[PDB]
């Protein structure tokens, strides 16, 4: 019986460390990859938006 | 050719307009979408991170 309790602590603490790591790392990987990716998407969209604004001004002159 | 050009030019404009309209709605999509993309997973991810710790009692 008390071995059940020990097994529970063994899995919970192995899980705790796996989880402190997975909780943090899954977010740091997904989250930093996401902002890095979307920081670039945001910049590329802003660049394209500026280019289209310029393109629209050029057509207006045409 | 004049009519085909007007139609093609009109379509060049409409298709390019659709391209810049979609590039914009896509950017405006994706950009707002990445916000969701970056915060829905980070909020839920940090919620789950926190859960490992929230449940450490």
């Amino acid at each position: 019986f008390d071995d059940i309790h020990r097994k529970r602590m063994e899995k919970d603490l192995n899980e705790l460390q796996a989880l402190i790591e997975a909780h943090f790392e899954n977010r740091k990987k997904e989250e930093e990859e996401l902002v890095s990716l979307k920081d670039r998407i945001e910049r590329r969209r802003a660049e394209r938006a500026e280019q289209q604004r310029i393109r629209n001004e050029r057509e207006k002159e045409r | 050719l004049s009519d085909k050009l007007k139609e093609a030019e009109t379509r060049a404009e409409f298709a390019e307009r659709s391209v810049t309209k979609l590039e914009k709605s896509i950017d405006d999509l994706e950009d707002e979408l990445y916000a969701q993309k970056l915060k829905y997973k980070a909020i839920s991810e940090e919620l789950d991170h926190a859960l490992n710790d929230m449940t450490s009692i």
Partner: peptide, 29 residues
Amino acid sequence: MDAIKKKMQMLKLDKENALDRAEQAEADK
């Protein structure tokens, strides 16, 4: 809360069993 679902079962069962033991330990007289 998977951690809770199982910890919940563990503690409810362990406290209920411990309580059942507390109650019997005295109740047996």
